[PDB]
């Protein structure tokens, strides 16, 4: 879809293997903010969004946190935090035709900069001048959308680039999308290096007397320390006790 | 003027409208250091210097604090702090002649 109507797909309940992404050399830009691409396999994400669109090449740099420009100001804005990745690859052969490709559109005019992850598909006639439009395109009344005009011969800057922005949510909340990272049998009374659904620590995992509610998945005591966790397979509760340390 | 003899004008004792910067379409690089581009309409400056020159496009990068190259080293050097804005636009149609 065009950059103004960028297409969002909600990825959930899958085993996502990101290795194919960074291994492939087709992608031109693979810039990840907040996460390292090589470590994308080990992580588990609360939810994943895939926002795909077609942009001009020189505007690919505008898809980043804290960046300004026509695409960022009026078409697609990325939050400053943005724990995610941006993957853009050139698609001149696919998205350019003989004559011109005018299917793709971008928003020249908007009254105010759009909020992060906001979509504006309204085609209302923008009012640049003082005189109200009342819906007619005139001297200072313009259609807010402009065609890119993709042609087979264009500079690298002007050639179309397909962009996919993967927005991850990383938190202690239950995780749906996880990397493969196999699995391993559970052990109770021994200081180990547990990796329950992304959480990482060192401690013995005793049986828990704590009464979890069905939606509860992990326990925190006073001072906010993760002292209980529900494993994602057995649906059982385990109390975490860090194994002994003491002066000598 | 040429970059080596860059032409400097003092702007003072006047009210400044920066809309010409936002309205114009020519400006390719609009990079501000120490100030924000959108907030120049709400700031008061003790004295302004508007230096101007003509450079080659590949050298536009060298007009910035802490940069090295022929233009920065020998023609026009910007201070490291440099609270100010650099505005550069292509002028191929006007500054190029037959021959």
């Amino acid at each position: 879809a065009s950059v103004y109507a960028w297409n969002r797909k909600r990825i959930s309940n899958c085993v996502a293997d990101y290795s194919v992404l960074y291994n492939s050399a087709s992608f031109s830009t693979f810039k990840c903010y907040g996460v390292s691409p090589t470590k994308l396999n080990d992580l588990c994400f609360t939810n994943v969004y895939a926002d795909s669109f077609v942009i001009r090449g020189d505007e690919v740099r505008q898809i980043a946190p804290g960046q300004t420009g026509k695409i960022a100001d009026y078409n697609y804005k990325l939050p400053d935090d943005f724990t995610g990745c941006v993957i853009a690859w050139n698609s001149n052969n696919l998205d350019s035709k003989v004559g011109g490709n005018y299917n793709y559109l971008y928003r020249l005019f908007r009254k105010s900069n759009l909020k992060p992850f906001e979509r504006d598909i309204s085609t209302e006639i923008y009012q640049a001048g003082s005189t109200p439009c009342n819906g007619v395109e005139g001297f200072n009344c313009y259609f807010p959308l402009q065609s890119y005009g993709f042609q087979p011969t264009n500079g690298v800057g002007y050639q179309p680039y397909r962009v996919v922005v993967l927005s991850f949510e990383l938190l202690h909340a239950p995780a749906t999308v996880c990397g493969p990272k196999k699995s391993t049998n559970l052990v109770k009374n021994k200081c180990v290096n547990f990796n329950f659904n992304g959480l990482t620590g060192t401690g013995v995992l005793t049986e828990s007397n704590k009464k979890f509610l069905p939606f509860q998945q992990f326990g925190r005591d006073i001072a906010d320390t993760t002292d209980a966790v529900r494993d994602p397979q057995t649906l059982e509760i385990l109390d975490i006790t860090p194994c002994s340390f003491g002066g000598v | 003027a040429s970059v080596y003899a860059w032409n400097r004008k003092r702007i003072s004792n006047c009210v400044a409208d920066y809309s010409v910067l936002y309205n114009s379409a020519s400006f390719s690089t609009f990079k501000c250091y120490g100030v924000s581009p959108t907030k120049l309409n709400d700031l008061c400056f003790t004295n302004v210097y508007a230096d101007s020159f003509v450079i080659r496009g590949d050298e536009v990068r060298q007009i910035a604090p802490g940069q090295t190259g022929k233009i920065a080293d020998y023609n026009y050097k910007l201070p490291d702090d440099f609270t100010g804005c650099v505005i550069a636009w292509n002028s191929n149609n006007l500054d190029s002649k037959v021959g």
Partner: antibody
Framework: VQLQQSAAELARPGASVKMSCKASGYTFTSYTMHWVKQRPGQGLEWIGYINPTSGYTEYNQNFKDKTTLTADKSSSTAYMQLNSLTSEDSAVYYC???????????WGQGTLVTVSA | IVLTQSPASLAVSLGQRATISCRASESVDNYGISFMNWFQQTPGQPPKLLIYGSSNQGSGVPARFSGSGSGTDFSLNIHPMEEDDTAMYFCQQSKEVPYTFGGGTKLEIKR
């Protein structure tokens, strides 16, 4: 987007001529309509533009007095009335629809107004 | 705005670049975009839009026609000029209400 006009009108000096531009292929209610003058073998002069939704006409300074513009959304037709025709007004007048942020964008054939006694 | 259209009578052979230049008395750019537009008129036909904006191409416009420029100066170039390009080319500004057309350039094939 096709526009059709009247054809080859001739009028004696001092007369008035009404030309009709018939719109097609669009709403005709959301696009302003411009009228442009072209002397034979010369440049183009923009006469003036009209808004069909609200009859707000804006004319060029030279052509404010001797020209008037009307619109009829009932038949989807724009009209020009030229008044006080003289020799200098003999020309091919053009009717255009506004588009792509251009005043005159989609032009239609052309109506020749010949002022001669 | 007064648009001055340099060379208004160009003779270029087939496959040769043709450059028509339009300069303006005042700035034509506004709201971050450019408003000067290039029209083509073949004899016996109404003018048709080639280039809306400084560089964007009109509907059904071949890649030969390229518009460029900004500020107060713009140019139209036809590098692989074809026999079907013999026409009149106008430059027109949309920045201010009185739309002004240039003098017009008559393009002819050279021999």
């Amino acid at each position: 987007v096709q526009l059709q006009q009247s054809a080859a009108e001739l009028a004696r000096p001092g007369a008035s001529v009404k030309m009709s531009c018939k719109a097609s292929g669009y709403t005709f209610t959301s696009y302003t309509m411009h009228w442009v003058k072209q002397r034979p073998g010369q440049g183009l002069e923009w006469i003036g533009y009209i808004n069909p939704t609200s009859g707000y006409t804006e004319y060029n300074q030279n052509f404010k007095d001797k020209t008037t513009l009307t619109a009829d959304k009932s038949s989807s037709t724009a009209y020009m009335q030229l008044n006080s025709l003289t020799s200098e007004d003999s020309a091919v007048y053009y009717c255009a629809r506004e588009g792509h942020r251009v005043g005159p964008a989609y032009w239609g054939q052309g109506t020749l107004v010949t002022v001669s006694a | 705005i007064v648009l001055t259209q340099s060379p208004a009578s160009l003779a270029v052979s087939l496959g040769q670049r043709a450059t028509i230049s339009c300069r303006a008395s005042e700035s034509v750019d506004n709201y971050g975009i450019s408003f000067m537009n290039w029209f083509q008129q073949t004899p016996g036909q109404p003018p048709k839009l080639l280039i809306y904006g400084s560089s964007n191409q009109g509907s059904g416009v071949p890649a030969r026609f390229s518009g460029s420029g900004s500020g107060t100066d713009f140019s139209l170039n036809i590098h692989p000029m074809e026999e079907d390009d013999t026409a009149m080319y106008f430059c027109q500004q949309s920045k201010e209400v009185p739309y002004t057309f240039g003098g017009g350039t008559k393009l002819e094939i050279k021999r």
